[PDB]
């Protein structure tokens, strides 16, 4: 029974896709079949901005930030709750929440 029309991943007009590695476990996962998530974080805590401003120079200069991308396999994404099992009708909703 074909659960998903995509068969679990988006791939059309192609025969092979270069695989990548997971993060929590580092499993072999296809590039499209993986789960891509964005975690844009700051270099300090929300409560550490005041301490940094008191103990910084350069006239309260803008604190930088870190952009990193995470690739999760199916099992790790489900376990880490970044991706969860949905109902049959709700599976088709590809729009992010």
């Amino acid at each position: 029974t074909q659960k998903r029309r995509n068969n679990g991943r988006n791939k059309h007009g192609r025969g092979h896709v270069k695989f990548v590695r997971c993060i929590n476990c580092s499993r072999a996962v296809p590039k499209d079949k993986a789960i891509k998530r964005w975690t844009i974080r700051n270099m300090v805590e929300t409560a550490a901005i005041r301490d940094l401003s008191e103990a910084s120079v350069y006239s309260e200069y803008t604190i930088p930030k870190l952009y990193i991308k995470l690739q999760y396999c199916v099992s790790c994404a489900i376990h880490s709750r970044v991706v969860r099992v949905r109902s049959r009708e709700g599976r088709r909703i590809r729009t992010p929440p």
Binding site: P64, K65, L66, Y67
Partner: protein
């Protein structure tokens, strides 16, 4: 990057050992739904210096563009990289390290390349991401002595 060259009475002189943009800036510049053009070139200045310069640019959305695509064809990318090449030679030919850096602080390369490449694609945020030196002269003792010593 500043390499220490000479030491003279509890004071060490430095020379330009290269420049690069920070990782935060580079990651902020690179984004999805756009095309990035990267070009490099090994250039020889007036004196015996070899420098590999790296320049990265990004295509610019016009304004009223509706599609979130704004890509560029491979032929257009090659033409832009050719534009990147001819402008680098033009702006570094008759320039020493003094004049090369002097054009480097205000991004003269970027300002004078966006106009040239505007006939192919708008482009934006064209910056010299890195420059690496490879061949330094023999300690440049007399040249550094003449250049420095003020105050």
């Amino acid at each position: 990057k500043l390499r220490v060259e000479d030491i003279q009475g509890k004071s060490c002189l430095t020379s330009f050992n290269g420049l690069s943009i920070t990782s935060d800036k580079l990651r902020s510049l690179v984004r999805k739904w756009q095309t990035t053009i990267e070009a490099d070139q090994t250039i020889k200045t007036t004196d015996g210096y070899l420098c590999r310069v790296f320049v990265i640019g990004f295509t610019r959305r016009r304004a009223n563009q509706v599609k979130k695509t704004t890509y560029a064809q491979s032929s257009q990318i090659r033409a832009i990289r050719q534009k990147m090449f001819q402008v680098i030679q033009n702006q570094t030919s008759s320039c020493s390290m003094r004049e090369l850096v002097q054009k480097l602080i205000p991004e003269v390369i970027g300002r004078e390349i966006e106009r040239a490449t505007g006939s192919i694609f708008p482009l934006q945020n064209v910056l010299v991401r890195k420059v690496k030196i490879l061949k330094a002269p023999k300690h440049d003792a007399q040249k550094l002595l003449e250049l420095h010593g003020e105050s």
